[PDB]
Short mmCIF file of C-alpha atoms and ligand atoms in Angstrom, two decimals:
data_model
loop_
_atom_site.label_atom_id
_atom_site.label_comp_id
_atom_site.label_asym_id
_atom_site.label_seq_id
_atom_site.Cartn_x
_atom_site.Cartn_y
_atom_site.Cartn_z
CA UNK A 1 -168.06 147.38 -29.11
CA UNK A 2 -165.95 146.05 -26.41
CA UNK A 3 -166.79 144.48 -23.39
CA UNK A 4 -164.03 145.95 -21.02
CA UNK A 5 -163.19 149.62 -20.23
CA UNK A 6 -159.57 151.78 -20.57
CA UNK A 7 -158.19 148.88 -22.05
CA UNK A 8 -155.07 151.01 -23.56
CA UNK A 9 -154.98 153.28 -19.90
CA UNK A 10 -155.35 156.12 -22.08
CA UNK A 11 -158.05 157.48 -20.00
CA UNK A 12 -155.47 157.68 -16.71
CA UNK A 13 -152.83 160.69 -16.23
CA UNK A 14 -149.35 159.22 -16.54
CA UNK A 15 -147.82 158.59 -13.36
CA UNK A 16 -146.98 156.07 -10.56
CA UNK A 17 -150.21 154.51 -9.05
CA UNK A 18 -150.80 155.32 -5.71
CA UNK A 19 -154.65 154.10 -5.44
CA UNK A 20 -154.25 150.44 -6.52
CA UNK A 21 -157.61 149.86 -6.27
CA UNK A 22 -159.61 152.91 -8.20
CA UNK A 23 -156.66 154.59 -9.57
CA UNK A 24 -156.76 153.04 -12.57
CA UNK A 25 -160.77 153.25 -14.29
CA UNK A 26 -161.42 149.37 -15.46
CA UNK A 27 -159.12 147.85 -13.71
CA UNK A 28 -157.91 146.64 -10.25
CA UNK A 29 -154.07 146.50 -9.33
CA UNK A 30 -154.26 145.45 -5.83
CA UNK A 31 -151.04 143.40 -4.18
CA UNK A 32 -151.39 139.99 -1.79
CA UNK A 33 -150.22 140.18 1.57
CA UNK A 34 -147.50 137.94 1.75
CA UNK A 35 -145.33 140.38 -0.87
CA UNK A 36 -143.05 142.30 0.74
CA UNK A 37 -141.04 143.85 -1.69
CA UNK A 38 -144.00 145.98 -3.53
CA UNK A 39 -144.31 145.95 -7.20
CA UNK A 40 -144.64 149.59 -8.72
CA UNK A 41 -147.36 150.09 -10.55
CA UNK A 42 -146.82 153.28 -13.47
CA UNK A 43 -148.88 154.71 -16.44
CA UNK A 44 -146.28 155.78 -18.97
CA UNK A 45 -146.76 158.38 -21.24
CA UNK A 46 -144.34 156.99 -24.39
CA UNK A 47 -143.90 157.06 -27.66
CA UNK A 48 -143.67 153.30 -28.78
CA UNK A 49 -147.15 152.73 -27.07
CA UNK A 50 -148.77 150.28 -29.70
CA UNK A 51 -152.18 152.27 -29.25
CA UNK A 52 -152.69 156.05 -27.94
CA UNK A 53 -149.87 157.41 -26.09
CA UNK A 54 -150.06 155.29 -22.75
CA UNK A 55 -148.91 151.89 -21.53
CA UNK A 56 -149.10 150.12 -18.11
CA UNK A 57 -145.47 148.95 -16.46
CA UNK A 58 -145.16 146.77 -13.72
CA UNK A 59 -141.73 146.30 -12.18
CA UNK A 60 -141.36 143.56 -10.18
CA UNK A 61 -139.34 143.67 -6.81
CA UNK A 62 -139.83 140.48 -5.25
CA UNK A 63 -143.02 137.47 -5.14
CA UNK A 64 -145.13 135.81 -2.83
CA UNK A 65 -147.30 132.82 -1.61
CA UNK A 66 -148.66 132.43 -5.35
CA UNK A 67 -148.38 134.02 -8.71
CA UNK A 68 -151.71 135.90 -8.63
CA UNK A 69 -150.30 137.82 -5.88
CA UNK A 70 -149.06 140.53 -7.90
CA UNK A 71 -151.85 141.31 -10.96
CA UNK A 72 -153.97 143.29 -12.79
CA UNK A 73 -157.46 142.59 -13.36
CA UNK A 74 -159.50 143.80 -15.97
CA UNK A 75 -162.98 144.99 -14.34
CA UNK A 76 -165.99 144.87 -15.29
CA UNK A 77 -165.83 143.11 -18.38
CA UNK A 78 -169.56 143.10 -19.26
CA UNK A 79 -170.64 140.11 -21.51
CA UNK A 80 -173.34 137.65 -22.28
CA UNK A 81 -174.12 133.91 -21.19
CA UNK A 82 -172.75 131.66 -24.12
CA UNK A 83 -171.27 134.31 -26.59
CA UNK A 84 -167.62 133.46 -27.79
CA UNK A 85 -165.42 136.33 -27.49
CA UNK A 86 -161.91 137.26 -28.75
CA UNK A 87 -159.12 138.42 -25.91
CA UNK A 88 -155.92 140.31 -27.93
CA UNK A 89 -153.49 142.09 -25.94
CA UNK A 90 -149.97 143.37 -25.95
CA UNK A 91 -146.95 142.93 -23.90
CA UNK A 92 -143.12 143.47 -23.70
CA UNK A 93 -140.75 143.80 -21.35
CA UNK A 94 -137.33 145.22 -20.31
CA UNK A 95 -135.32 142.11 -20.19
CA UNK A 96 -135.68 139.21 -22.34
CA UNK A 97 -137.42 135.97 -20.20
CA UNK A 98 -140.45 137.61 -18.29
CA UNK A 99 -143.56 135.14 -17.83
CA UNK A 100 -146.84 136.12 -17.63
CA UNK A 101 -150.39 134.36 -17.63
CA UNK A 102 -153.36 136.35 -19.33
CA UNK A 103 -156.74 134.84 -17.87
CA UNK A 104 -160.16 135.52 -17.69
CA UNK A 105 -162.98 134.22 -15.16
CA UNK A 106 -166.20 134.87 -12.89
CA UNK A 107 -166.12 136.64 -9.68
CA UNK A 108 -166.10 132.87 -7.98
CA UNK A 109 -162.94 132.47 -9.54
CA UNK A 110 -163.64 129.93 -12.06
CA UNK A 111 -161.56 130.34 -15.29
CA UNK A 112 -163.19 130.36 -18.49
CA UNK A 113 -160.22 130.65 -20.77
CA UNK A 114 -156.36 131.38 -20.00
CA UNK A 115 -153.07 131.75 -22.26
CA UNK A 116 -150.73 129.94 -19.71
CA UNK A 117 -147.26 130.82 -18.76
CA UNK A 118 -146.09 132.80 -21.59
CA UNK A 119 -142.66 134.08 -22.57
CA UNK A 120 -142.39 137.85 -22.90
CA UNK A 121 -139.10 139.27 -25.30
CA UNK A 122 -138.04 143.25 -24.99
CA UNK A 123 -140.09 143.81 -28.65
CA UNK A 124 -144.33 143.98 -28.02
CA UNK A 125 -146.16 141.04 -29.26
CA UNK A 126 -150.01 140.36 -29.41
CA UNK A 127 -151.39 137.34 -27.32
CA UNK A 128 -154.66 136.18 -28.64
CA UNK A 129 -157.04 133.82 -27.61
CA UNK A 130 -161.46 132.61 -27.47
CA UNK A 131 -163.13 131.80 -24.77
CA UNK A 132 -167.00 131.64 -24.41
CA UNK A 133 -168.99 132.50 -21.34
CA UNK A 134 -169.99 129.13 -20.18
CA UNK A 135 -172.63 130.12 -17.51
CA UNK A 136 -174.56 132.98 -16.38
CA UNK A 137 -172.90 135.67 -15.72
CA UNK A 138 -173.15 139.31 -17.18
CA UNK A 139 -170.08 140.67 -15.06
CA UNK A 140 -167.00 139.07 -15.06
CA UNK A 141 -163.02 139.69 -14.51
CA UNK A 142 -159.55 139.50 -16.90
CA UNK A 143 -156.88 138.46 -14.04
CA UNK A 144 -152.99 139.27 -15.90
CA UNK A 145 -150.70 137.37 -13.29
CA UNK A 146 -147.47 138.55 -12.72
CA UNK A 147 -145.75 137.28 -9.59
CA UNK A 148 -143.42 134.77 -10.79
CA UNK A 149 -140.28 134.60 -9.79
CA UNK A 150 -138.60 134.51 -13.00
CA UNK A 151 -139.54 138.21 -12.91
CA UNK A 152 -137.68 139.49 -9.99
CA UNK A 153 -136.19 142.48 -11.49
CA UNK A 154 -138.02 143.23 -14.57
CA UNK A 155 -140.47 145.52 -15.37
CA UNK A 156 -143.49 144.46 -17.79
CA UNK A 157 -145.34 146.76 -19.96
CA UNK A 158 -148.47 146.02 -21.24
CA UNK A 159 -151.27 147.98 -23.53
CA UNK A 160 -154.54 147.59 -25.63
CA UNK A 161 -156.55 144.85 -24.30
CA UNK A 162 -159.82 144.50 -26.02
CA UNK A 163 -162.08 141.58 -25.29
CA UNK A 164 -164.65 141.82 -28.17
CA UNK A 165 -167.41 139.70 -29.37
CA UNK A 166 -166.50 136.97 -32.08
O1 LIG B 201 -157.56 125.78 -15.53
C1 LIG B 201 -156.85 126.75 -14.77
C2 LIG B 201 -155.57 126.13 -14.22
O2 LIG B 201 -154.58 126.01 -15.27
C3 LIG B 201 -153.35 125.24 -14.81
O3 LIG B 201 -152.53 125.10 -15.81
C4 LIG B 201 -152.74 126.05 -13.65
O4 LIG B 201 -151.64 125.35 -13.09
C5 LIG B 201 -153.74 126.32 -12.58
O5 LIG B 201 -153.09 127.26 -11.67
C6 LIG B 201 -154.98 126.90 -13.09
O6 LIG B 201 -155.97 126.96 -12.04
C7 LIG B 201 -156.47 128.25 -11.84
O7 LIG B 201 -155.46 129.10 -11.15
C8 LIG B 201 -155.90 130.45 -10.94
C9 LIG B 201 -154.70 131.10 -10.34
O8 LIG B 201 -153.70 130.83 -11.30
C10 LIG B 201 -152.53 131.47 -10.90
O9 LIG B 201 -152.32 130.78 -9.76
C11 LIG B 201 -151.72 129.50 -9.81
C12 LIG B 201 -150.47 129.55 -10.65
O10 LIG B 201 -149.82 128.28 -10.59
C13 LIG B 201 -150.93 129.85 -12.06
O11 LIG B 201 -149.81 130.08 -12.89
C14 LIG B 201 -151.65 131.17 -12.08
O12 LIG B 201 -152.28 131.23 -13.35
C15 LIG B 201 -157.14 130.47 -10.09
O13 LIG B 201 -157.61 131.80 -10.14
C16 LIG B 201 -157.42 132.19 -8.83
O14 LIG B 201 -158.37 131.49 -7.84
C17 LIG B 201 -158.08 131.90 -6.46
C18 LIG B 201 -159.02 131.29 -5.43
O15 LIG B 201 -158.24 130.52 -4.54
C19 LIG B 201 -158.99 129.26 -4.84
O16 LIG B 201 -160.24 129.35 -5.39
C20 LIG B 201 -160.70 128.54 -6.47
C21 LIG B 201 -159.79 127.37 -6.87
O17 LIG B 201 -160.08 126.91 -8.18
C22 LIG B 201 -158.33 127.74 -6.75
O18 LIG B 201 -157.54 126.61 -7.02
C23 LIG B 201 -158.03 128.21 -5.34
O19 LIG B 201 -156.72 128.75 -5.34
C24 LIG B 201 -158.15 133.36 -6.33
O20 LIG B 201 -157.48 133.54 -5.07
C25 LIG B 201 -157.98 134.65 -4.35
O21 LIG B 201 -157.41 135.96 -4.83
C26 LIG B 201 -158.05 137.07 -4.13
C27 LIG B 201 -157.42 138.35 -4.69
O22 LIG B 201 -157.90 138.57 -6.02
C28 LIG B 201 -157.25 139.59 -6.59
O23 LIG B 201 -155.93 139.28 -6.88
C29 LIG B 201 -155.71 138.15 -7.69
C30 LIG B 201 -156.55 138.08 -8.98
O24 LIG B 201 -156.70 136.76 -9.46
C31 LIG B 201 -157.99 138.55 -8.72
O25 LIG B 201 -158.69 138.81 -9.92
C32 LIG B 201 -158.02 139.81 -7.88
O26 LIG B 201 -159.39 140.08 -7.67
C33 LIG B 201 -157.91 136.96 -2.64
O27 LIG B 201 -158.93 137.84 -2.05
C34 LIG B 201 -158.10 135.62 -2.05
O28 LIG B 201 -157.33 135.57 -0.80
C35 LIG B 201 -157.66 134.47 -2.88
O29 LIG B 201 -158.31 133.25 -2.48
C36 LIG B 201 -157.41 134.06 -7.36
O30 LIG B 201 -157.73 135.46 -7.42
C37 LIG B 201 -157.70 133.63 -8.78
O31 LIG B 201 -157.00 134.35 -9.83
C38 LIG B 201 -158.17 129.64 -10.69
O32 LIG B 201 -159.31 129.62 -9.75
C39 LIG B 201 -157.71 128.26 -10.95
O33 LIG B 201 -158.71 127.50 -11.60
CA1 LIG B 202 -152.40 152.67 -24.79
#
């Protein structure tokens, strides 16, 4: 039983993403207004995908105002007031020295848990973390941050989030 949806994208046809906001079932893509240089957004169909046959890359083309500005959010991500849950995910990416922060939080924004600023290599690791659902909400969101500006060139792949129940 997991709490989000499509966490591998193997429910989406393979392509670039032209609907960032319901192209992608269980998660939203959308970009801030202050980047100029859009990301691209593609499901890939390949055959090192650590689960199923899809991943998610996100090529990055330029930043702005604030590293949240280019993302993917996992949503919904249905859980329970004070049950401790287990985030795993994994990511890689073209060139060695990509950063990424994997978060998750309520729809006022409030963080319950993050892994902070981590270094990505070109070979897929898991990230892992807990976090428990400190108030009361049922529905909440998994915000992956990509916009920093160590990125500017690379592309980022990512694949099989599950956010389970410890
Ligand atoms: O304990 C957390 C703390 O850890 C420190 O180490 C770190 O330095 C802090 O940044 C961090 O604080 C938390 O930051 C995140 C954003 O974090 C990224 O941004 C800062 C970077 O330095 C850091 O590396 C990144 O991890 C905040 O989450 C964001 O909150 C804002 C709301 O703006 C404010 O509201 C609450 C307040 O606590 C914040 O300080 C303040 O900025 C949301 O901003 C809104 O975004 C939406 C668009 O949302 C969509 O795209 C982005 C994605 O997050 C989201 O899920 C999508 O739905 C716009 O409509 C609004 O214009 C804009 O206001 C961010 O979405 C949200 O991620 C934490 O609140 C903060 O605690
Ligand atoms: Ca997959």
């Amino acid at each position: 039983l997991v709490a989000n949806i499509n966490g591998g994208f193997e429910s989406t046809p393979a392509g670039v993403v032209t609907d960032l906001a319901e192209g992608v079932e269980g998660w939203d893509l959308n970009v801030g207004s202050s980047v100029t240089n859009p990301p691209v957004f593609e499901v890939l169909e390949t055959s090192d995908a650590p689960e199923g046959n899809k991943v998610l890359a996100v090529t990055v083309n330029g930043v702005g105002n604030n590293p949240f500005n280019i993302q993917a959010t996992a949503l919904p991500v249905n859980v329970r007031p004070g049950v401790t849950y287990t985030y795993t995910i994994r990511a890689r990416a073209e060139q060695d020295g990509a950063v990424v922060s994997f978060t998750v939080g309520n729809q006022s924004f409030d963080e319950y848990g993050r892994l902070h600023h981590q270094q990505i290599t070109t070979e897929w690791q898991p990230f892992t973390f807990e976090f428990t659902v400190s108030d009361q909400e049922t529905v909440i969101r998994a915000p992956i941050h990509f916009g920093y500006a160590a990125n500017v060139g690379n592309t980022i792949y990512i694949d099989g989030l599950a956010i389970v129940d410890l």
